[PDB]
Design a binder for this molecule. Structure first.
Ligand code: CU
Ligand code: CU
Ligand code: FE
Ligand code: FE
Lengths: 156, 160
């Protein structure tokens, strides 16, 4: 299927973060986000480990699961910020974090932020010298932003 | 195996549905956060489920050989000829060889021949699938827990 980039890929710490969008989708189970006909698009964070990910045990290019991802969407010039939790899921092209999204201020230019929290107590690290890793997860969320995304309506 | 330390197989690697399941064990480890399993000095070994997608995994969007996250894994440890069952919840975690499900384990029944079962529950509400025709997948998660069994695992103490 056809994917449209929100911006250029961005590296942040051990992560490579891409944002794309395309037509809204049907999810099973439904999750938190709007149903397909209630939404403008599907939005996704493709989050993989870059070369620095080996400090935490990740292979380069691998998906990084158990993160907590949400998008902050703000029309440029506006005070209102829309927040959308993303969920981990598979499409036909593989795992990603995503949600169906309705742009609540309609057509126009937006600032799009992906807030990426580390796993927390869900996920452990081996830290012994024999089997463990010396990298560590980040305390405050990684925030990746694209500044002048133009929502121009259904391009599909 | 792991390029940076010594893993020992529990038995043959098995296929079950879209999953390729391998069981290994090695010296007990330190985890951060500590999680629910025993501390390094109190345990016999670390026990790990290596769960990846086989070729059938593409029906769910997985790439072949990719780690399968968000599963709920627990181990049932039963000495052959005994009625007592030890149950060990695994947690997701990273070692130097990457993500896996594991726990430190102390074999409560001592050295001997054990039946080892890994029961693997699907993600449920923790992982979604696209099911529309344009972007979605054709397969669905299993509803009944997958069970991978090794009937003659010999625990003979540390191998390290
Ligand atoms: Cu999605
Ligand atoms: Cu482990
Ligand atoms: Fe995608
Ligand atoms: Fe391993």
């Amino acid at each position: 299927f056809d994917e449209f980039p929100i911006g250029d890929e961005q590296d942040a710490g051990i992560l490579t973060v891409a944002g794309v969008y395309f037509q809204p989708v049907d999810m099973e189970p439904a999750g938190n986000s709007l149903s397909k006909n209630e939404a403008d698009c599907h939005m996704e964070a493709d989050i993989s480990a870059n070369e620095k990910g080996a400090t935490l045990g990740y292979g380069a290019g691998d998906f990084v699961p158990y993160l907590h991802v949400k998008a902050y969407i703000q029309k440029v010039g506006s005070s209102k910020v829309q927040e959308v939790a993303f969920m981990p899921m598979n499409a036909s092209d593989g795992p990603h974090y995503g949600a169906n999204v309705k742009f609540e201020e309609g057509l126009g230019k937006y600032n799009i932020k992906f807030e990426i929290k580390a796993p927390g107590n869900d996920y452990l690290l081996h830290v012994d010298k024999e089997t463990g890793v010396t990298g560590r997860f980040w305390t405050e969320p990684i925030v990746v932003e694209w500044k002048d995304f133009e929502w121009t309506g259904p391009q599909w």
